[PDB]
Every structure is written in structure tokens, then in C-alpha cells.
Amino acid sequence: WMPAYACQRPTPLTHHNTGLSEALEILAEAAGFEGSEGRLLTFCRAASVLKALPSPVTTLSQLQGLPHFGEHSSRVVQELLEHGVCEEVERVRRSERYQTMKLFTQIFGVGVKTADRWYREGLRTLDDLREQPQKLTQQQKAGLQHHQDLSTPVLRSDVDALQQVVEEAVGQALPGATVTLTGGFRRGKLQGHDVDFLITHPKEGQEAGLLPRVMCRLQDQGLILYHQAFERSFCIFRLPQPGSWKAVRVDLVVAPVSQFPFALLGWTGSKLFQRELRRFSRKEKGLWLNSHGLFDPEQKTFFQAASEEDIFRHLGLEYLPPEQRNA
DNA sequence: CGGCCTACG
DNA sequence: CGTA
DNA sequence: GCCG
Ligand SMILES: [Mn+2]
Ligand SMILES: [Mn+2]
Ligand SMILES: [Mn+2]
Ligand SMILES: [Mn+2]
Ligand SMILES: [Mn+2]
Ligand SMILES: [Mn+2]
Ligand SMILES: [Mn+2]
Ligand code: NA
């Protein structure tokens, strides 16, 4: 009895099938690089099923009946069980296309379509991109300029220092506004690629215009290396370190308090968890979910939520705390 | 056959 | 397109 | 790739 949607089962951060799930996730990533979003989704889902299992898979028999395992995903597990290696996964790993697409798409500002164009033009290294600067957006220029720092794990000590300076700026911009850590750190991860914060105010409407004021105040303290009426800011901060500094990606999001549970849920992830929750909402309950609200399209009304628990309840789902959303 | 999350910058 |  |  393993439910078919990732939002229906707890997925902890530490699980028991990392070898198998990591192989399936290489095939998912490669499917994305080739423009096959459906295959990507199936391989992601199959990997996530293994993360939810209570014990290591030892025998092919233990896959029978599990959702999202068909011929292809089962063969990959079978080969890993019997041989320790899957020829398809290894061919992908070793391939110039996979390695370069991974290198390029890891850059802030570069997705699959851009990386693929560059690949087809013959580019292979970061220095190749640096050699043709006029072919870069400002966002990509910043991602490349800070690429080394942005590839360094963000630690909890960084999170805590960043939360302090964001809270200081937010408090200077709007008394009573609050700052909530979201993203992977709220799910219990000890490291990350960035830090995500959600900002609100308990009085509906007071948060109007807040994010530009927060950004100005951070910029005047020398904390901003890159930023773009707005409600989401995808920033690079100049984080002080002893005797120096490092660039860190920081996402700042403002939501009115009416939307705060929806934004908190949406920004806490995981990414697969949130896509699966929205799919469940629409396909199983007929309701439309995003980070703003939950809409009943037949009554034309929005569900009023005071908490994440309220949203799960309205969807008929057992509540999962953030640390069990690691699908 | 046809879907696969759903927004903002 | 990119970001989440 | 898997599934409704
Ligand atoms: Mn366990
Ligand atoms: Mn196949
Ligand atoms: Mn064999
Ligand atoms: Mn994050
Ligand atoms: Mn909005
Ligand atoms: Mn088809
Ligand atoms: Mn297909
Ligand atoms: Na990227």
C-alpha cells in the first residue's frame, strides 16, 4: 500500500535507497536535457517512491505493485541490484552532452534551452561562455561571475547571518513585518544552494510596496551584488565572512497575510512535492492550487486558510510537516 | 490518446 | 526565455 | 515513462 502521489506519503530527508534513487534521478535529469518532461517526471516519481520505503530494496520482487515502476525503471533497479551498475546510467554519466548540459544549467540564468543552444554551437566550458560576453543576459553575467561562490554549500551559519540582516532591513522598512525561513532549510536540510525567505505583515495590505524598500535598504548596506512593483526577488548577496565575503543566492518573497499559508506551503517544497500536490489538487479534488490560494472553479471562491494544516485538510490529505515533504 | 504545477521577472 |  |  504505497500511495501514487508524493503528497500522500511521508518522505524523510534520510532514507534507505539512495543508490537506486540517485540512478533514477540521473535518467530524469538526462530526460530533461533532451526535452522529455514526461519521462523526467516519471523517473523523478519513481525515485521518490524509493525514498518513501521503510527499508532497502534488496530484490526485484520488492518493486511489485509500486506506483511509477514499469519496464524501464524496474530494469534500472534490476541491473543495479544484480551488477552494482546500470549501463544506461553510466553511458549518460560519462557523456559529454550530459556533463556539459549539467555544467551549463547549473549556472544562475541558464536553463535547458539556453544550454542546448550553446552546446549545439560548440561551447563546452565556463571559460567558453566568458569569451562571448555579449551573448549573456545580465542575470547570466551575474551567475557566471559568482559561479564559484554559488557552487559552495550554504551552511546553517550562513542562513542565520542572512536571516539577521534580512530581518534588520525588513524591520527598518515596515515595523511589525516578519521573516520566515522557507525552502530546503525549513525541510531540515543542513546545507543548500541558496536561502529562501518569506516576508509578510499581520495587517492585510501593509506589505504593499515592501520588497523595493527592503532591497534599497539592503543595497545601501552593501549587501547586494545582483538583483532584478514586484513580489519576488532572486538576489545574490555579498555575505560578510571573517576578513572577506562570499556571494550567496537569496530568494526574497513578499505575501499578504491572507496568502501566507499558501506561500509558506509552496516555498517549502520539495519541488516534486509541490508539483504533485498541485496535480493532486486539480486531478483528484477539482481545486486549483498555487502559492497564492486554493480556488474552487465551480463556486468561483478561494479557500480561506490560516495554516498549512488547513490546506492539507481542505484537500483531504493527512498533514505532513516540512521535514516529511522531501519527495 | 494525451497529460504531466503554476506562478512571477 | 529565466526564476521559484 | 508511466498512467487515467
Ligand atoms: Mn527510515
Ligand atoms: Mn524504455
Ligand atoms: Mn544483467
Ligand atoms: Mn532553496
Ligand atoms: Mn501576487
Ligand atoms: Mn502519447
Ligand atoms: Mn513517451
Ligand atoms: Na540554471
Give the Cα separation of A255 and A232 in Å (integer).
9
Task: Measure, in angstroms, how far nucleotide C3 C1' is from residue A80 CA.
Answer: 35
Distances (CA, A) of A21 to A28, A42, A68, A89: 10, 12, 13, 12
Ligand that lies nearest to the alpha carbon of residue A249, given by its number in the listed order = 4
Task: Measure, in angstroms, how far nucleotide B6 C1' is from residue A82 CA.
Answer: 41
Residue-wise over A189-214: b if at least 16 C-beta within 10 A, else e?
Answer: beebbbbbbbbbbeeeebbeebbeeb
Task: Measure, in angstroms, how far nucleotide B7 C1' is from residue A240 CA.
Answer: 33
Q: Is A160 annotated as a binding residue?
A: no
A93 CB-to-strand B distance under 7 Å: no
Task: Tell me the sheet residues that pair with A296.
Answer: A301
Q: Return chain A residues 179..198 having CB < 7 Å to nucleic acid strand D.
A: none
Cα torsion A202, A203, A204, A209: sign: negative
Q: Give me ligand 8 centre to Cα A271, in Å.
A: 15
Cα torsion A261, A262, A267, A270: sign: positive
State the catalytic residues of A. 194, 196, 251
Helix axes A18-33, A71-83, angle to 10 degrees: 130
Q: Is A194 annotated as a binding residue?
A: yes
A230 CB-to-strand B distance under 7 Å: yes
Name the nucleotide with the smallest C1'–CA separation from A70.
D2
Annotate A150-216 with DSSP letters as a single string: HTSPEEHHHHHHHHHHHHHHHHHHSTT-EEEE-HHHHTT-SEESEEEEEEE-SSTTTTTTHHHHHHH
Tell me the resolution in Å: 1.6
